[PDB]
């Protein structure tokens, strides 16, 4: 059993999550598909355009979007800045999917590039964790010394966790307040995008600065880069910290189960 | 300086990688854009269809594809099996992007779901690392005992790394040999997809089983699930192992630099 057989609860947990996900908005999905098909009929009707023509045109439009032609006026998907953003997505393992290589040489170069750089950035996130723990312990010593005269301390996993999620939500509010007037999203939409990007998931449904023109383009790009870096660092730190916290809790509950149900 | 100022080489390294990426196929991108615009002109011409109509139609077709209408006949993006695949993408932090929530309730539920489940799977990958190390040390003891009579051993990071990338490439060949006759990709394309999915990146340009119909649908789905799980586990293990290996090497080179260049 041990920590190891937690996969039973894991599989049950994806099962339950999938169930509740399905029940909560299958209605939305049916409505979307129905209304999409309805305008398909409408658009074919009002333009006298056959179904095979739409078949081919939409298929190969999807091909070209895979080549990176986001329908609104966007940046060149890939340049010095474009390849910089692409690689920054790659090494951090976000995988937004807005920029993907097309040539087999680019593909195999990406294979080597990921293999030799993604662990480097994961370890750099680990180094950021080490810095944050050390510096926060130092400032805790400083605050204690101040209130007395006015690893080291090794702050507990609980308090480290609490202040870590506090920093996470705070930087989420700052990032949202900087994105919303620019991207034009909503506050909850920007929060969701921040969580997706910082948690390494990178769905790509909502993506950061991609338009061709932005006010103070260089400054905005630098701010977006530093915000994404800090957010992903803090969220990865929180992920590891609550990982060890929940494994402590799981060991505790398994010990209780073994002692009671002997 | 320490391990900490490695960010200088890191930024230089993304800079150089971006440069070589750009130089190596900006030609391909220009050609793609030019030929795409050219058929745009052609298609508007041969159907007498204005530019604003295409503007709206393509914009909101992208909206509906964001709702999940992959143009080829695909599975219902999201069902018991669909939400299962969606969540399996979520918890493993792959983020393929083929399935995304649309309602704000679904969004906030995904916030809690990720926050409370993604670290669980990262720690489960850590547990898989611990199992693999322990079991491989046990089999190394077994092989040593066999050849003598016919942490424990704690295999070194170098040999663990070597056999770990060996297992990675092997499972890559098996996954590619099982995907290529089904998905219809190429061998190098399937290798690239396997690396993308196993390395947590999950671009979504090439995605696993999504068509509505597959031969032996249940068996194929189970095989895809177990293959993806094993591949991502092995690749994450390799990532951590070479992370510690390159930090050893970086400490070594920094010590050399500090000893030689002593200011
Ligand atoms: C035989 C005696 C049983 C000893 C306990 C080991 C059971 C092996 C199952 C390992 C856990 C399954 C996890 C997985 O398969 O993903
Ligand atoms: C003043 C004396 C210098 C002492 C050394 C600490 C320098 C602080 C820079 C930290 C590294 C920058 C990393 C980043 O910003 O991403
Ligand atoms: K990821
Ligand atoms: K990802």
Look at the block and give the residue holding tokens 């509010």. Answer: A173
Extract the runs of DSSP E, i.e. beta strands, from B45-88.
none
* A42 to chain B: closest CA residue: B57
Residues in a beta bridge with A74? A211
Residues in a beta bridge with B74? B211
Look at the block and give the residue holding tokens 């999409």. Answer: A36
> Which has the closest alpha carbon to B85: B250, B171, B207, B203?
B207
CA A240 to chain centroid, in Å, comes to: 15
Across the interface, whether the CB atoms of B36 and A67 are under 8 A apart is answered yes
Tokens of residue B127, six digits: 């547990």
Extract the runs of DSSP E, i.e. beta strands, from A136-207.
none
Tokens of residue B47, six digits: 């159907």
Q: Determine whether the annotation assigns residue B180 to a binding site.
A: no
| B218 Cβ contact list (under 8 Å, min separation 6) | none
Distance B96 CA to ligand 3 centre (A): 9
Whether chain A has a CB inside 8 Å of the CB on B78: the answer is yes
Q: Where are the domains of chain B?
A: 50-260
> Which has the closest alpha carbon to A243: A161, A138, A140?
A161
Residue A141 per-residue DSSP state: H
In this structure, are residues A192 and A258 in contact, taking their beta carbons and an 8 Å threshold? no
Which stretch of DSSP H or E encloses residue A145? Answer: helix A104-149
First-last CA distance in chain A: 13
Question: Which of B:86-115 have CB within 8 Å of A?
Answer: 86-88, 90-91, 93-97, 100-111, 113-115
Tokens of residue B232, six digits: 């991502």
> Which has the closest alpha carbon to A66: B217, B205, B133?
B205
Across the interface, whether the CB atoms of A18 and B95 are under 8 A apart is answered no
Decide: helix, strand or coil at residue B214: coil
Note residues around ion ligand 3 (Cβ under 5 angstroms).
A 93, 200; B 93, 200
Across the interface, whether the CB atoms of A102 and B28 are under 8 A apart is answered yes
What does the DSSP assignment read for B36-86? HHHHHHHHHHTTT--HHHHHHHHHHHHHHHHTS--SSSB--SSSHHHHHHH
> Which has the closest alpha carbon to A137: A149, A129, A127, A125?
A129
Helices (DSSP H) in B92-207: which residue ranges?
104-149, 157-183, 187-198
Across the interface, whether the CB atoms of B243 and A126 are under 8 A apart is answered yes
Q: Is B1 in the pocket of ligand 2 (CB under 6 A)?
A: no
Provide the shortest C-alpha distance from residue A151 to chain B (in Å). 17
How many CB pairs below 8 Å do chains A and B form together?
273
Q: Whose CA is nearest to atom 14 of ligand 2?
A: B7
- What CATH code would you report for B50-260? 1.10.287.70
Provide the shortest C-alpha distance from residue B103 to chain A (in Å). 7
Interatomic CA distance for residues B213 and B79, integer angstroms: 15
Interatomic CA distance for residues A249 and A235, integer angstroms: 20
Decide: helix, strand or coil at residue A211: strand
Decide: helix, strand or coil at residue B211: strand
Decide: helix, strand or coil at residue B74: strand
What does the DSSP assignment read for A101-139? --SHHHHHHHHHHHHHHHHHHHHHHHHHHHHHHHHHHHH
- Per-residue CA distances from B25 to A77, A101, B29, B160, B253 (Å): 13, 9, 7, 36, 34
Region of residue B74 (left: phi > 0; alpha: psi -120 to 50; beta: else)? beta
Which stretch of DSSP H or E encloses residue B257? Answer: helix B217-260
Decide: helix, strand or coil at residue A74: strand
Q: Which segments of A are annotated as binding site for K(+)?
A: 93-95, 200-203
Tokens of residue B104, six digits: 């704000």
Tokens of residue A50, six digits: 């056959």
* B241 to chain A: closest CA residue: A119
Q: Is B115 in the pocket of ligand 2 (CB under 6 A)?
A: no
Across the interface, whether the CB atoms of B28 and A103 are under 8 A apart is answered yes
* Residue B48, number of CB atoms within 10 A of its CB: 8
> What helix, strand, coil percent values describe chain B, rounded to 5?
75, 0, 25
């Amino acid at each position: 059993a041990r920590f190891l057989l937690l996969a039973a609860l894991i599989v049950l947990y994806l099962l339950g999550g999938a169930a509740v996900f399905s029940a909560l908005e299958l209605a939305h999905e049916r409505q979307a598909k129905q209304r999409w098909e309805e305008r398909l009929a409408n658009f074919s009707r009002g333009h006298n355009l056959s179904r095979d023509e739409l078949r081919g045109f939409l298929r190969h439009y999807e091909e070209a979007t895979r080549a990176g032609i986001r329908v609104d006026n966007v940046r060149p998907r890939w340049d010095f800045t474009g390849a910089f953003y692409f690689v920054g997505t790659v090494v951090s393992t976000i995988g937004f999917g807005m920029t993907t290589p097309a040539t087999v040489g680019g593909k195999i170069f990406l294979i080597f590039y990921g293999l030799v750089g993604c662990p480097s950035t994961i370890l750099f996130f680990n180094l950021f964790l080490e810095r944050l723990i050390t510096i926060i312990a130092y400032i805790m010593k400083s605050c204690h010394q101040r209130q007395l005269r006015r690893a080291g301390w090794k702050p507990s996993v609980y308090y480290v966790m609490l202040i870590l999620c506090t920093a996470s939500i705070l930087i989420s509010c700052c990032a949202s307040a900087m994105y919303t007037p620019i991207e034009g999203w909503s506050y909850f939409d920007s929060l969701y995008f921040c969580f997706v990007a910082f948690s390494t998931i990178g769905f790509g449904d909502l993506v950061s600065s991609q338009n061709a023109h932005y006010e103070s383009q260089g400054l905005y790009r630098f701010a977006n880069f530093v915000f994404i870096l800090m957010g992903v660092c803090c969220i990865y730190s929180l992920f590891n910290v609550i990982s060890i916290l929940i494994k402590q809790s799981l060991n505790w509950i398994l010990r209780k189960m073994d002692s009671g149900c002997c």
